[PDB]
Amino acid sequence: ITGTSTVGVGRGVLGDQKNINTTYSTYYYLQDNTRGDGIFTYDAKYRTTLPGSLWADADNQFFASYDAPAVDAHYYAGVTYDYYKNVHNRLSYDGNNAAIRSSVHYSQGYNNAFWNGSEMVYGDGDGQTFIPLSGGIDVVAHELTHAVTDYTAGLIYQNESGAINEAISDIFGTLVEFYANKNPDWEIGEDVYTPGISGDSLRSMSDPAKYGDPDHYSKRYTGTQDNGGVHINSGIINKAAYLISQGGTHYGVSVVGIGRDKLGKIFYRALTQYLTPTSNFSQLRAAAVQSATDLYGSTSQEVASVKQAFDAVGVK
Ligand SMILES: CC(C)C[C@H](NC(=O)[C@H](CC(C)C)NP(=O)(O)CNC(=O)OCc1ccccc1)C(=O)O
Ligand SMILES: [Ca+2]
Ligand SMILES: [Ca+2]
Ligand SMILES: [Ca+2]
Ligand SMILES: [Ca+2]
Ligand SMILES: [Zn+2]
After folding, report:
1. Which residues does the annotation say bind Zn(2+)?
2. Which ligand is nearest to the CA of 121?
3. Are the CB atoms for 22 and 78 separated by under 8 Å?
4. Residue 211: other Cβ atoms inside 10 A
5. Ligand 1 atom 18: the closest Cα is on which residue?
6. Which of these, 165, 275, 182, 185, lies nearest to 230 by C-alpha position?
7. Of 21, 33, 112, 183, which shows the fewest CB atoms inside 10 Å?
8. Where does the chain show beta strands of DSSP type E?
9. Nearest to residue 50, comparing CAs of 101, 13, 98, 10?
10. Is 74 labeled as catalytic in the residue annotation?
11. Are residues 296 and 164 in the same domain?
């Protein structure tokens, strides 16, 4: 859409008011011209045909219930773009300011969100297991991060490399949640999962076992479902990442925490410089150790904490 940049206001999934970047040309569109080559939000209209229609509104006010998921997918994708640029100096997912596209209201009662190889897609949930998925900033950043991985390490979505792929998305989705300071935690999907149950979440990084996911390599899923447990074995890496940042004693192994910022720095560098499509857990350990060495020196505390964390979850 060619037109004039403006700013509209709307209400998100959780009922919060926010300003969003729009474009005016007869109608007001969900097109943000301020970030890279743009952020574009589409209406999939309860269908599965993608991307749908670029989102058009007559008055630049998005307070209708149908508007909510579009407001949050659009705003959160801008925050995520900002985190990557400001913290890691990366311009969009491809590092060259590629336009970011998202489609909301996909299918009917769809309990998921995904990156399709080219855009982000968000279900509205069935109203019980989930509310519209774009209302969770960690969900939005998890999605966008699948694009970053695809453009960098290219981790195949199955078995060990696939669980690394999932852990990266959970790790950066949590870092983005802390960055925006939106009631941050080490849990995934809490803001959009089981609207009737308080206190739960989809996965836990602090204690993956809480929901039945492994927190040690010896408890790894060896089966075939979920692409060989990509959403299951990611718990082993999630736990390692939480220990590096926060510290703690796990299975008798003590880790001194080095904080989130450094965790982000070491993970980003492993991702963009050392990981490959087929990397396994043991290769990730080597990658993280080498990144920390590059950044802080072989004899630093940072390197020491990375080794301890991996030894705690039984990776190597
Ligand atoms: C019950 C669901 C939410 C759990 C799980 N999905 C998830 O954990 C998150 C959403 C979550 C952060 C809210 N979605 P995802 O990005 O991991 C699903 N992606 C996904 O399955 O991607 C594979 C794919 C490749 C190419 C084209 C299309 C799809 C799953 O698919 O098993
Ligand atoms: Ca309107
Ligand atoms: Ca939170
Ligand atoms: Ca969270
Ligand atoms: Ca809940
Ligand atoms: Zn994922």
Report:
1. 142, 146, 166
2. 1
3. no
4. 14
5. 114
6. 165
7. 183
8. 4-11, 17-25, 27-29, 31-32, 39-43, 53-54, 56-57, 61-62, 100-106, 113-115, 120-123, 187-188, 203-204, 248-250, 253-255
9. 101
10. no
11. yes
